[PDB]
PDB file of C-alpha atoms in Angstrom:
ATOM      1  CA  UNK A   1      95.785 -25.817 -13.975  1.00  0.00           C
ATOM      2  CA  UNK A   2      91.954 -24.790 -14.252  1.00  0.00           C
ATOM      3  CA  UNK A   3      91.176 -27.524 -15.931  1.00  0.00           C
ATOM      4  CA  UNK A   4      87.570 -28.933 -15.546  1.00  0.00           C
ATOM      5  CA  UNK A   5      86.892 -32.483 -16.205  1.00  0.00           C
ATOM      6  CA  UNK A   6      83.820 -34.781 -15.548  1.00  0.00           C
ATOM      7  CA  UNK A   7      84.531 -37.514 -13.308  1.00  0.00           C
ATOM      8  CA  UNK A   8      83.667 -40.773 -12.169  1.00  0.00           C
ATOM      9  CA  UNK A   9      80.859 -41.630  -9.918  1.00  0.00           C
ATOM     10  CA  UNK A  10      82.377 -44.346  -8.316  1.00  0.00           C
ATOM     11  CA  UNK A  11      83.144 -44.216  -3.959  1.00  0.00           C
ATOM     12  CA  UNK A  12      85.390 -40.788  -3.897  1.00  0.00           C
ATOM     13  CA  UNK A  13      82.731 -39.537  -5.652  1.00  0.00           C
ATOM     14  CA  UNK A  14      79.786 -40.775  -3.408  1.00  0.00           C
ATOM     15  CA  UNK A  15      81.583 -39.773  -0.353  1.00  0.00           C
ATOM     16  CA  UNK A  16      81.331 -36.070  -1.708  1.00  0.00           C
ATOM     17  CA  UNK A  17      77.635 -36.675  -1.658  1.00  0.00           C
ATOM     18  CA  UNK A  18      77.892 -38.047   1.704  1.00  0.00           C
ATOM     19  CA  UNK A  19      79.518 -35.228   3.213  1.00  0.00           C
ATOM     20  CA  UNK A  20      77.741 -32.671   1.486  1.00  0.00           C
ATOM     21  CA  UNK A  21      74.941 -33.567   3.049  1.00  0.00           C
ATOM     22  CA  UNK A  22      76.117 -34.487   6.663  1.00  0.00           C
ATOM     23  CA  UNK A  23      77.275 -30.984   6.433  1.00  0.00           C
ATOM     24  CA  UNK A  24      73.997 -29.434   5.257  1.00  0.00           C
ATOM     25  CA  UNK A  25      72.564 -31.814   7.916  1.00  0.00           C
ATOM     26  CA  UNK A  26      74.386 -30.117  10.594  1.00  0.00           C
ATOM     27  CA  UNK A  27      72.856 -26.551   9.052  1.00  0.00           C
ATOM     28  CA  UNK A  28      69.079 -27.715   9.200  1.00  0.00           C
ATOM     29  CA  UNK A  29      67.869 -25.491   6.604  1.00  0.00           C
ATOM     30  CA  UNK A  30      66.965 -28.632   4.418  1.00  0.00           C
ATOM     31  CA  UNK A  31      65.395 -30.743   7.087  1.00  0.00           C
ATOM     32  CA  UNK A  32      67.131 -33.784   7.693  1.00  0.00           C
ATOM     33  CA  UNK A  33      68.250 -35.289   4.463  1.00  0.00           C
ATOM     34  CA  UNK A  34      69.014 -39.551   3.769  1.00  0.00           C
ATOM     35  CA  UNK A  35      72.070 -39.884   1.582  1.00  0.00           C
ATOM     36  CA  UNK A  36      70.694 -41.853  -1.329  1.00  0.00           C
ATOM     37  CA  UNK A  37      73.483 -41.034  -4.089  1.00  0.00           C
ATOM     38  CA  UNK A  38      75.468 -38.926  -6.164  1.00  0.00           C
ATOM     39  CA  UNK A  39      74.457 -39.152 -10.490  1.00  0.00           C
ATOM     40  CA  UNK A  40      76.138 -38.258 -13.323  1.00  0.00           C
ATOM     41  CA  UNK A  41      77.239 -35.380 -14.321  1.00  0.00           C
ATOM     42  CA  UNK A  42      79.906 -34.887 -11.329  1.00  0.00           C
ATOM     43  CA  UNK A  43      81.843 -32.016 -12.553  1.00  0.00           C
ATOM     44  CA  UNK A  44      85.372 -31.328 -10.698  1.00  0.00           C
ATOM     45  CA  UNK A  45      88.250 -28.123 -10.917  1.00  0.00           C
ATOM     46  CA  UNK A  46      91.858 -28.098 -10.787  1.00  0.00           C
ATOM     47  CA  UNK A  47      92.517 -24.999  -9.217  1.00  0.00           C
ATOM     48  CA  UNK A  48      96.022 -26.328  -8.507  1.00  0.00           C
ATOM     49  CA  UNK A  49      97.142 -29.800  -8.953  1.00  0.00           C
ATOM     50  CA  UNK A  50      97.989 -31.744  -5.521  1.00  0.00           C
ATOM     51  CA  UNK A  51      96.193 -28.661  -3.562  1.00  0.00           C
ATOM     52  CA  UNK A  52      93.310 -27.318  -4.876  1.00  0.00           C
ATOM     53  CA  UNK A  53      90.019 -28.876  -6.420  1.00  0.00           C
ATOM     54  CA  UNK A  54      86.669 -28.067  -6.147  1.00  0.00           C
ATOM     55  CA  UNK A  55      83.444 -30.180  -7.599  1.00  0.00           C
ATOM     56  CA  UNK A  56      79.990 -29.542  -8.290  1.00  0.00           C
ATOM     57  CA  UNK A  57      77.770 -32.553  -8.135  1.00  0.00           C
ATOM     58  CA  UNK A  58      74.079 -33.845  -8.239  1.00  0.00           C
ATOM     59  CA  UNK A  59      72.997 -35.595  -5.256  1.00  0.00           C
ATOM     60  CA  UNK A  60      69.846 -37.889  -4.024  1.00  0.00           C
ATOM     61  CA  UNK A  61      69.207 -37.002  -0.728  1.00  0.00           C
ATOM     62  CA  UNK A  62      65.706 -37.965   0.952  1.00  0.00           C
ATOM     63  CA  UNK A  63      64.462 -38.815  -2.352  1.00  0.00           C
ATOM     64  CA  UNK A  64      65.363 -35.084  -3.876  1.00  0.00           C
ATOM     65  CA  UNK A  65      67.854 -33.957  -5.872  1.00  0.00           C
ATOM     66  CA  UNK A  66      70.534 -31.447  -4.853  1.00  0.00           C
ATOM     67  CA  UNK A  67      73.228 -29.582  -6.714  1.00  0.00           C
ATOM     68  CA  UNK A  68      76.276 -28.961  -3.958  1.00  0.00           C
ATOM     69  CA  UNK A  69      79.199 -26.952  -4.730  1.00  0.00           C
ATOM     70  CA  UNK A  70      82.551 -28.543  -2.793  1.00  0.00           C
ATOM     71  CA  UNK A  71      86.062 -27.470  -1.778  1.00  0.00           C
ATOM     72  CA  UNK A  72      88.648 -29.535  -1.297  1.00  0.00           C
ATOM     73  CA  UNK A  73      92.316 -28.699  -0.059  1.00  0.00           C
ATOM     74  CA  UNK A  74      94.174 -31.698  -0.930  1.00  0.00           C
ATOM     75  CA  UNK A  75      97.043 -31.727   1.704  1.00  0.00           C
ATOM     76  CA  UNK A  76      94.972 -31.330   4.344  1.00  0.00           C
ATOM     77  CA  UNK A  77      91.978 -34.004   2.707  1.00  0.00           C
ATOM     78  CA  UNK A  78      89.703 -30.945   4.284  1.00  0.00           C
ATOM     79  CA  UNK A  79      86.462 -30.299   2.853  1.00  0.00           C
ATOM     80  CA  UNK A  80      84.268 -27.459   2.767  1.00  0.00           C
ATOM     81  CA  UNK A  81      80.555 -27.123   1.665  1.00  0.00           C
ATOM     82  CA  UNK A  82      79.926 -23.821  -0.150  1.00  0.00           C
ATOM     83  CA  UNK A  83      76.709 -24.358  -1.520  1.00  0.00           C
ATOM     84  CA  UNK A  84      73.256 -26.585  -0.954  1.00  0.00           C
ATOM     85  CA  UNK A  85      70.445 -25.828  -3.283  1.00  0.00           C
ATOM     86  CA  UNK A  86      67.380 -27.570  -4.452  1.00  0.00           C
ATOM     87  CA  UNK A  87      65.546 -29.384  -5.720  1.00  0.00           C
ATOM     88  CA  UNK A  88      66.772 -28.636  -9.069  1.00  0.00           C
ATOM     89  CA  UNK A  89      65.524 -29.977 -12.042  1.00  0.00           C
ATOM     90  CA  UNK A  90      67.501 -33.311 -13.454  1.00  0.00           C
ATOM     91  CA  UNK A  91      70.378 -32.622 -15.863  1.00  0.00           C
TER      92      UNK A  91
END
């Protein structure tokens, strides 16, 4: 357990970038953002395998890019945003 790994960018992936920002979305602090993707390097955490990961990923969203910090409890497939930041500058 622990163990981080970079991961694929492939539709899991994007989906983390969508709900990041639906979620920021419903905060307003960041206007109202346009999913546009998530890029390489998506970053994820085994806190416990089959229960708890967490990811940090960079996303396009209204033609900026974001770094989002996400929870995930994996028996519930509940989400939860902890962080929104940005811009940031590309990795």
């Amino acid at each position: 357990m622990g163990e981080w790994e970079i991961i694929d960018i492939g539709p899991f992936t994007q989906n983390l970038g969508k709900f990041a920002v639906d979620e920021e979305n419903k905060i307003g602090q960041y206007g109202r953002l346009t999913f546009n993707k998530v890029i390489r390097p998506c970053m994820k955490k085994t806190i416990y395998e089959n229960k708890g990961y967490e990811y940090q990923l960079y996303v396009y969203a209204s033609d900026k890019l974001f770094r989002a910090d996400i929870s995930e409890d994996y028996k519930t497939r509940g989400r939860k945003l902890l962080r929104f930041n940005g811009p940031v500058p590309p990795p």
